[PDB]
Write a protein that binds this ligand. Sequence first.
Ligand SMILES: CCC1(OC(=O)N[C@H]2CCCCC/C=C\[C@@H]3C[C@@]3(C(=O)NS(=O)(=O)C3(C)CC3)NC(=O)[C@@H]3C[C@@H](Oc4nc5cc(OC)ccc5nc4C)CN3C2=O)CCCC1
Ligand SMILES: [Zn+2]
Length: 197
Amino acid sequence: MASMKKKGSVVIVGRINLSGDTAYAQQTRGEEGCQETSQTGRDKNQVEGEVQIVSTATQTFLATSINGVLWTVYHGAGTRTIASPKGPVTQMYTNVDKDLVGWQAPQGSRSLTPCTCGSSDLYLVTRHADVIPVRRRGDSRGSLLSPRPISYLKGSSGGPLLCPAGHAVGIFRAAVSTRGVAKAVAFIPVESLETTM
Ligand SMILES: CCC1(OC(=O)N[C@H]2CCCCC/C=C\[C@@H]3C[C@@]3(C(=O)NS(=O)(=O)C3(C)CC3)NC(=O)[C@@H]3C[C@@H](Oc4nc5cc(OC)ccc5nc4C)CN3C2=O)CCCC1
Ligand SMILES: [Zn+2]
């Protein structure tokens, strides 16, 4: 029992800047600081924007603020806490059946508005700041207009699918691939988030 160690916290290591006319990734913490912060759970870095890049000791992915909740995927964050200025913050939502988890949105972040447009012309934001057009094909599926290797989507779970007006339509969860080529994406619809809330 004295042998038992504790898993670290999820740590914000950067963000996807969507403020200006060009989307681009920004890193705010290096790996050494990330490991330190994951162990203590104390993150004093200023947080900005809607789409955060987050990391565990072993994985990196995305987290998206919608309606005051920072959402990400269970297969990335598990039940882990998230680092914050005051220490680790326990998850506010956990749903393994939806592959979804959520924490209170960090101070200084900006939240996306849940989409009510009903549009099927979507846009997926990746960890490399690519804005990929996606046609909605179902409640939780969308097809890439320009397919590409799954390598380009790896690490983007937790990122947003946006409507033409910039509302949040869903959280990126999985890729549908054929011969390593991503043709479609599975995602957590914002309505499912609003229900969980
Ligand atoms: C055939 C089943 C189908 O498709 C697929 O499963 N395809 C695969 C192709 C993988 C090849 C690479 C995929 C590329 C990008 C993918 C966007 C990202 C991503 O980027 N992750 S990541 O950031 O790199 C990472 C790992 C966090 C750090 N998601 C993934 O990799 C995702 C992880 C896992 O699926 C799930 N695991 C769980 C696990 C839970 O408890 C443990 C609970 C619920 C849960 N729910 C899931 C749907 C496999 N995953 C796929 O995407 C499911 C829905 C449509 C059909
Ligand atoms: Zn909308």
